[PDB]
Design a protein around this ligand. Structure first.
Ligand SMILES: NC(=O)[C@H]1CCCN(C(=O)Cc2cnccc2C(F)(F)F)C1
Ligand SMILES: [Zn+2]
Length: 140
């Protein structure tokens, strides 16, 4: 579990969005596993606008932040689960790091800000949904 709070927006994994997030929907993309909802309170996270490939992510299954090297956002094949059939998820970045079911929503950060959130994983890999191309998160 976990979310990004920037401006008047709440960014979450689409598969973990609540019925309230859908009522307050701003934008969603099933192919990216992302959902953005509106908030009454202003958030304090800053989104990174860079091409960094190294950062630090939060791993809830270990209660630890780990430094990682990660790939550029790409179309990556993800196995079927209770949330989606087998498909390609877009804007996904992979790293060698621990993750287990329950870890989605952990923040990946670099020196410039929030890069993304955990969205996939398995076999000593962890996948992050990139948010650095969503330039509109900085305005209105
Ligand atoms: N983006 C998706 O399709 C997710 C939806 C939930 C399921 N999913 C996973 O990969 C779940 C997973 C499995 N093994 C290790 C780590 C994980 C976790 F980090 F929690 F994602 C795909
Ligand atoms: Zn950066």
């Amino acid at each position: 579990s976990g979310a990004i709070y920037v401006g008047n927006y709440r960014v979450v994994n689409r598969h973990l969005a609540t019925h309230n997030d859908w009522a307050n929907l701003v934008w969603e993309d099933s192919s990216r596993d992302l959902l953005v909802s509106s908030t009454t309170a202003q958030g304090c996270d800053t989104i990174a606008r860079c091409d960094c490939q190294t950062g630090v992510y939060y791993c809830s299954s270990r209660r630890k932040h780990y430094p990682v090297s990660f790939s550029k956002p790409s179309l990556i094949f993800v196995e079927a689960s209770e949330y989606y059939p087998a498909r390609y998820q877009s804007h996904l970045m992979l790293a060698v790091g621990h993750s287990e079911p329950g870890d989605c929503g952990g923040i990946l950060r670099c020196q410039h800000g929030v890069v993304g959130i955990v969205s996939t994983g398995g076999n000593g890999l962890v996948g992050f949904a990139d948010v650095r191309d969503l330039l509109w998160l900085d305005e209105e």
